């Protein structure tokens, strides 16, 4: 009926605690927020189910 709700700080998975990763990962665009939309989506879907 449901699966475990998961969430990711995409910057923390990719290379959190490092500033040069904040400088570099910004060059890629919304390829974190798209995941945060996709997963916050899955999570509200489980309580719908």
């Amino acid at each position: 009926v449901s699966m475990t709700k998961t969430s990711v700080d995409c910057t923390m998975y990719i290379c959190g605690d490092s500033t040069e990763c904040s400088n570099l990962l910004l060059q890629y665009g919304s390829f974190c927020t798209q995941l945060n939309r996709a997963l916050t989506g899955i999570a509200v879907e489980q309580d719908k189910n």
């Binding site: 700080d9 910057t11 923390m12 959190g16 945060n36 916050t40």
Partner: protein, 145 residues
């Protein structure tokens, strides 16, 4: 404030009713701690110097140092020695550095002839009984005795 943050985050001055994901909170690493094992086995500079009697420079010593801590906290810290000098590692760094292979070079000389030891030098000590190589990087210590 959280209302202006969500307004901004949603690209929308009307935030409609809801709950919205924003600005991940993370308590910062509030300091850095460093923990290493006790620096217990000090290398025996008190045998190298604090020993009764040294030998003459044509018979220059080579006492082995290995498997110990190169702690200069009663060495480059001290005023008691007339000369301390280094030749490619900064003298502050001798507590920071690791060596592969270390040997003491002990002897006695005339006070003028203290200047004969430096790699790239002349005078009779620096020719007939002693010399150091052009790629040496260690340190010399000498004192009025």
């Amino acid at each position: 404030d959280p209302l202006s943050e969500t307004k901004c985050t949603l690209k929308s001055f009307t935030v409609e009713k809801g709950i919205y994901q924003t600005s991940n909170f993370r308590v910062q690493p509030t300091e850095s701690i460093v923990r290493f094992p006790n620096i217990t086995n000090l290398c025996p500079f008190g045998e190298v110097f604090n020993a009764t009697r040294f030998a003459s420079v044509y018979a220059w010593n080579r006492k082995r140092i290995s498997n110990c801590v190169a702690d200069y906290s009663v060495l480059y810290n001290s005023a008691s020695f007339s000369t301390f000098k280094c030749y490619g590692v900064s003298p502050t760094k001798l507590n920071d550095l690791c060596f592969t292979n270390v040997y003491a070079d002990s002897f006695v000389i005339r006070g003028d002839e203290v200047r004969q030891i430096a790699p790239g030098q002349t005078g009779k000590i620096a020719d007939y009984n002693y010399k150091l190589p052009d790629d040496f990087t260690g340190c010399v210590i000498a004192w009025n005795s």
